Design a protein around this ligand. Structure first.
Ligand SMILES: *[C@@H]1O[C@H](CO)[C@@H](O[C@@H]2O[C@H](CO)[C@@H](O[C@@H]3O[C@H](CO[C@H]4O[C@H](CO)[C@@H](O)[C@H](O)[C@@H]4O)[C@@H](O)[C@H](O[C@H]4O[C@H](CO)[C@@H](O)[C@H](O)[C@@H]4O)[C@@H]3O)[C@H](O)[C@H]2NC(C)=O)[C@H](O)[C@H]1NC(C)=O
Ligand SMILES: *[C@@H]1O[C@H](CO)[C@@H](O[C@@H]2O[C@H](CO)[C@@H](O)[C@H](O)[C@H]2NC(C)=O)[C@H](O)[C@H]1NC(C)=O
Ligand SMILES: *[C@@H]1O[C@H](CO)[C@@H](O[C@@H]2O[C@H](CO)[C@@H](O)[C@H](O)[C@H]2NC(C)=O)[C@H](O)[C@H]1NC(C)=O
Ligand SMILES: *[C@@H]1O[C@H](CO)[C@@H](O[C@@H]2O[C@H](CO)[C@@H](O)[C@H](O)[C@H]2NC(C)=O)[C@H](O)[C@H]1NC(C)=O
Ligand SMILES: *[C@@H]1O[C@H](CO)[C@@H](O)[C@H](O)[C@H]1NC(C)=O
Ligand SMILES: *[C@@H]1O[C@H](CO)[C@@H](O)[C@H](O)[C@H]1NC(C)=O
Ligand SMILES: *[C@@H]1O[C@H](CO)[C@@H](O)[C@H](O)[C@H]1NC(C)=O
Ligand SMILES: *[C@@H]1O[C@H](CO)[C@@H](O)[C@H](O)[C@H]1NC(C)=O
Ligand SMILES: *[C@@H]1O[C@H](CO)[C@@H](O)[C@H](O)[C@H]1NC(C)=O
Ligand SMILES: *[C@@H]1O[C@H](CO)[C@@H](O)[C@H](O)[C@H]1NC(C)=O
Ligand SMILES: *[C@@H]1O[C@H](CO)[C@@H](O)[C@H](O)[C@H]1NC(C)=O
Ligand SMILES: *[C@@H]1O[C@H](CO)[C@@H](O)[C@H](O)[C@H]1NC(C)=O
Ligand SMILES: *[C@@H]1O[C@H](CO)[C@@H](O)[C@H](O)[C@H]1NC(C)=O
Ligand SMILES: *[C@@H]1O[C@H](CO)[C@@H](O)[C@H](O)[C@H]1NC(C)=O
Ligand SMILES: *[C@@H]1O[C@H](CO)[C@@H](O)[C@H](O)[C@H]1NC(C)=O
Ligand SMILES: *[C@@H]1O[C@H](CO)[C@@H](O)[C@H](O)[C@H]1NC(C)=O
Ligand SMILES: *[C@@H]1O[C@H](CO)[C@@H](O)[C@H](O)[C@H]1NC(C)=O
Ligand SMILES: *[C@@H]1O[C@H](CO)[C@@H](O)[C@H](O)[C@H]1NC(C)=O
Ligand SMILES: *[C@@H]1O[C@H](CO)[C@@H](O)[C@H](O)[C@H]1NC(C)=O
Ligand SMILES: *[C@@H]1O[C@H](CO)[C@@H](O)[C@H](O)[C@H]1NC(C)=O
Ligand SMILES: *[C@@H]1O[C@H](CO)[C@@H](O)[C@H](O)[C@H]1NC(C)=O
Ligand SMILES: *[C@@H]1O[C@H](CO)[C@@H](O)[C@H](O)[C@H]1NC(C)=O
Lengths: 435, 123, 123, 123, 53
């Protein structure tokens, strides 16, 4: 046909790409780091566009992970270090009324701390959780802080909230984010109801293990997502289509006192407890949870067999940070025992521990001291998904709560988004020639 | 009227009428990540504009050239390419030949500029 | 001749002869502030050059188009506008219609560019 | 063909066939240093493109104007400039006169734009 | 009692040095040359600079 090459600029095509995204949105996150969000939800549906997604090869997860860790470290860096408190403690039993489940959990410790002046010392009394102290043999002491033998303990800055707030990860111009608006989306493979957005809906950096809190719900049915469901070494992300409300509390009324440990420094500690001492706990409605697991096994049988028995069991062992359900509540860190939720074959109260000196990730060499919060803490949150691991062990599959790899927490979200690079240039044969 | 990339699933013919809809969307310590992203957006825009300049297509969105289609890059007729295909499918179909086509376009302009210069040198 | 904005207070018909004077002055940790300032200046420049490209005015300072002037945008006669008014007063007067005009300019080029392609497709 | 600067030692005529080879290689604390390098490269590119636009040479690598050559700048004939001479030697000779030529190019294009505007205003 | 005390470096002078504030390209600074200008309202004369005094 005597066709000629015609060059078109502004062609609606793209290629998969990895680029640097920026965030948009008294707090760890979105202090000054993030750009004010454009309030207009400029979402464009792409009719007849099928896009292949892979939530386990999504570089937005790696960027979200690095951004959260970086912001966490930036928040804690300009704060009071507790190296002057790495001294032996004289600890005795708490003299208040202790319930059966709190015997030895909390101890009344005393120590000689520094003051505003280098040449002075003060005797300080405080209540520490057993998890935060370890035995030591010394002259006039019994225990020392658990992290002083590993790394410096940094006190979190007071009045800087750890509450997760939605963060929007937005693409630079020349790039676009595609969303998969597909009900019951597998999390991998072609997605027909693709749409283009400038950026995400606002993802809360909620940190938890085993149970996914304050996330997004499935549009119609529970969705089982796994990189390779056959391989038991992979974690399974279960997105629920209904929330399960979990009510977590620390009923003790804490009286919080503070001391100076140097010029301009301050250390916060629990001074005493008002009322009886009770164990922290979470209440999960029994009927709702039973229906939730019924739905989960109903979905699992599609991959494991219509006639297979599915069993749930508690975690297999290891560090508290991964064997229990870790979460932030009111600024406090709860480590709840989930064996009451995953103990079955196909009101529930879960006891919880509180730990003030924590390692936020698997990395070793850093530690943070979470200051106590005055009063009584009660949180109401939605369980929106589960992290499950399949037992290696033949029939009757056994599932357990998963771990704390964090990427799983940031794959429950960001599984429907892909970043693509726009390629405005293209060529095509036309009948048009110069002159 | 469909917005940025709204024509992505439409045929090449229909999509060719929305070039300006998305062309405007190519330009528009934590400071470094955002600043680098802005610089990269600028570098990609400028590389595409420079490439259009090399081909003699500066300032145009639909630029006709003097390079013939050789029927080996793709042997589809215009009816199938423009009425029964999208730009994503076309881009995939001739991806392996884009560097060849771009090279020919550069060579074509190099000859054309000399010809214009020679025509302009006649009194 | 008069300076960077020397013609700013002159009438439109006089200031229009100094467009190169203003055009040449649009391009030229503390490093972050300096880089953001330079990147922003570049981004604004490119936004204007891209917009001129969309309208078919790339490479020109005085670009004539095929969009008719609407008497509802400004009902002043041509002599009154160019002989007795400055560009600042005009910019204020036409501010509420600038985006309307820009939209029409884009539409005009989109039609013209397709028409040029069809004229070029005649053997 | 000869590489990025392969024609650097060739005569001015021969090196005029490689303008795209050099043109396509102009665009492509550690973060601050990398950003300053990228921004500076972009600013140099844009200043040169703006300057070509001011002269009416936007989108071209070889551009012919209406400014006559003054023998006071160089009185060598074409057989001494486009042959038997390289671009480096020429740049060394046309140093003190570069700003004069650029000023004349700007004025010539300003007159060209006004003349085109008047011609296009004739019904 | 409340603040950390940092000693100023003995080699770094506190002498005020004139600072010129300069606009980036694409922006300009307008200077008001109207004598007896009270800091607000229309300034009849105006001039354009890139950097302040
Ligand atoms: C999942 O999401 C839910 C919310 O959807 C989270 O629950 C919220 O958690 C935040 C933070 O813990 C709660 O905010 C706190 O509320 C306290 C009580 O607020 C009452 O009183 C005030 C009076 O002004 C009313 O405005 C308000 O509506 C309530 O009636 C406040 O006292 C807290 O402020 C104190 O602590 C913060 C610490 O950051 C300090 O900055 C303040 O200065 C002050 O000392 C704080 O505002 C919020 O109320 C909870 N919501 C609900 C509905 O209960 C879950 O925690 C979240 N889950 C996970 C795992 O992230
Ligand atoms: C932790 O131990 C300290 C030291 O014994 C207790 O503080 C004393 O408590 C008695 C009452 O039992 C007071 O009369 C003393 O004046 C307190 N001394 C100081 C230095 O505070 C403290 O009450 C104990 N706390 C708990 C919860 O058992
Ligand atoms: C969570 O609670 C369960 C039940 O109290 C604990 O399971 C017990 O673990 C011990 C470990 O030595 C076993 O001897 C018991 O037989 C288990 N009990 C039951 C009923 O099976 C579990 O260890 C607790 N986990 C955490 C992390 O605290
Ligand atoms: C500023 O306004 C003055 C007038 O107030 C301009 O100067 C003269 O104005 C008369 C008005 O009839 C003209 O005929 C003269 O030709 C103007 N003088 C010159 C030298 O052109 C003055 O030009 C205006 N300034 C600017 C920068 O435009
Ligand atoms: C403290 O409580 C623990 C609980 O197991 C008990 O074994 C211990 O003897 C108690 N010590 C004192 C001094 O009361
Ligand atoms: C002290 O640190 C070492 C090295 O990290 C560790 O092996 C040891 O268990 C720690 N001490 C206690 C009492 O846990
Ligand atoms: C929990 O789910 C309900 C569903 O209606 C919703 O209204 C509520 O806001 C959710 N709560 C949280 C904390 O996400
Ligand atoms: C969907 O997910 C399952 C596991 O949930 C996986 O085996 C399968 O390959 C995925 N892809 C498709 C197209 O079904
Ligand atoms: C999943 O893991 C099993 C382990 O035996 C392996 O054989 C299979 O090929 C894996 N599948 C995928 C899709 O990676
Ligand atoms: C949990 O349930 C128990 C049932 O006895 C109740 O006493 C307790 O107050 C509940 N706690 C919360 C936080 O809902
Ligand atoms: C409640 O849990 C038991 C566990 O054995 C199960 O048999 C029963 O069907 C469940 N009931 C529901 C989901 O209504
Ligand atoms: C699991 O449930 C059975 C009763 O069905 C109970 O005997 C057993 O102790 C429970 N295990 C855990 C770990 O809660
Ligand atoms: C704790 O006790 C103090 C005693 O003064 C009281 O003021 C405070 O309100 C109590 N807080 C709670 C949460 O019960
Ligand atoms: C999608 O395909 C249908 C097929 O009938 C067509 O009518 C529609 O216009 C297409 N969508 C777009 C955005 O081109
Ligand atoms: C284009 O080619 C297809 C076969 O590939 C044929 O069916 C169709 O009729 C052809 N159309 C024209 C207009 O030649
Ligand atoms: C001018 O604007 C008015 C607005 O009502 C419109 O009706 C009219 O058609 C426009 N005329 C032209 C020539 O654009
Ligand atoms: C332009 O309008 C003004 C309005 O006062 C009038 O005086 C002037 O004569 C008009 N000029 C022309 C050329 O129509
Ligand atoms: C633009 O619109 C506003 C609306 O409040 C009006 O006040 C203003 O006068 C209008 N400007 C022009 C130049 O018509
Ligand atoms: C260098 O000069 C020789 C003649 O001495 C010539 O043949 C050769 O082509 C020149 N090289 C280049 C790169 O122009
Ligand atoms: C050439 O340059 C000289 C420099 O002195 C100048 O006097 C002369 O007028 C110029 N000639 C032309 C034709 O521009
Ligand atoms: C150019 O000038 C040189 C000066 O030596 C002379 O030899 C040569 O013949 C001249 N060429 C022409 C074509 O006039
Ligand atoms: C430019 O001027 C300087 C002044 O010192 C002179 O030395 C140099 O030779 C001149 N260059 C040319 C090419 O005439």
């Amino acid at each position: 046909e005597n066709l000629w090459v015609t060059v078109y600029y502004g062609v609606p095509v793209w290629k998969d790409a990895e680029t640097t995204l920026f965030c948009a949105s008294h707090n760890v996150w979105a202090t000054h780091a993030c750009v004010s969000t454009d309030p207009n939800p400029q979402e464009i549906h792409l009719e007849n566009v099928t896009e292949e997604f892979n939530m386990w090869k999504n570089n937005m997860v790696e960027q979200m992970h690095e951004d959260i860790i970086s912001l966490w470290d930036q928040s804690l860096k300009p704060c009071v270090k507790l190296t002057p408190l790495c001294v032996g403690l004289q600890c005795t039993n708490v003299t208040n009324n202790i319930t059966d489940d709190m015997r030895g959990e909390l101890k009344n410790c005393s120590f000689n701390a520094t003051t505003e002046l280098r040449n002075k010392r003060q005797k300080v009394y405080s209540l520490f959780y057993r998890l935060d102290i370890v035995p030591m043999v010394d002259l006039w002491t019994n225990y020392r802080l658990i992290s002083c033998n590993t790394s410096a303990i940094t006190q979190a800055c007071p009045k800087v909230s750890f509450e997760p707030i939605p963060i929007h990860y937005c693409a630079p111009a020349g790039f676009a984010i595609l969303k998969c608006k597909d009900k019951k989306f597998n999390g991998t493979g072609p997605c027909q109801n693709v749409s283009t957005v400038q950026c995400t809906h606002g993802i809360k950096p909620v940190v938890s293990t085993q149970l996914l809190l304050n996330g997004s719900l499935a549009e119609e049915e529970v969705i089982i997502r796994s990189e390779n469901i056959t391989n038991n070494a992979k974690n399974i992300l279960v997105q629920l289509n209904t929330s399960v409300q979990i009510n977590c509390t620390r009923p003790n009324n804490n009286t919080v006192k503070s001391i100076r440990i140097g010029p301009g420094q301050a250390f916060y500690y629990t001074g005493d407890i008002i009322g009886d001492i009770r164990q922290a706990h979470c209440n999960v409605s029994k009927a709702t949870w039973n229906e939730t697991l019924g739905k989960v096994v109903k979905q699992l049988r599609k991959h494991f067999g219509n006639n297979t028995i599915i069993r749930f069991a508690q975690s297999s062992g290891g560090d508290l940070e991964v064997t229990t359900h870790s979460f932030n509540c009111g600024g406090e860190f709860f480590y709840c025992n989930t064996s009451g939720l995953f103990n079955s074959t196909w009101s529930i109260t879960l006891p919880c521990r509180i730990k003030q000196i924590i390692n936020m990730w698997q990395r070793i060499g850093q530690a943070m001291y979470a200051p106590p919060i005055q009063g009584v803490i009660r949180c109401v949150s939605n369980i929106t998904g589960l992290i499950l691991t399949r037992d290696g062990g033949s029939t009757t599959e056994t599932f357990r709560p998963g771990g704390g790899d964090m990427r799983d927490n940031w794959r429950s979200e960001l599984y429907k988004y892909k970043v693509v690079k726009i390629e405005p240039l293209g060529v095509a044969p036309t009948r048009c020639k110069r002159r | 009227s469909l917005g940025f990339l709204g024509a992505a699933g439409s045929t090449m013919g229909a999509a060719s009428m929305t070039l300006t809809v998305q062309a405007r969307n190519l330009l528009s310590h934590w400071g470094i990540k955002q600043l680098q992203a802005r610089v990269l957006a600028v570098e990609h825009y400028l590389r595409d504009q420079q490439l259009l300049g090399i081909w003699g297509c500066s300032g145009k969105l639909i630029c006709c050239t003097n390079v013939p289609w050789n029927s080996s890059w793709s042997n589809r007729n215009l009816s199938e390419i423009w009425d029964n295909m999208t730009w994503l499918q076309w881009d995939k179909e001739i991806s392996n030949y884009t560097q060849i086509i771009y090279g020919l376009l550069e060579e074509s302009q190099n000859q054309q500029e000399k010809n214009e210069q020679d025509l302009l040198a006649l009194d």
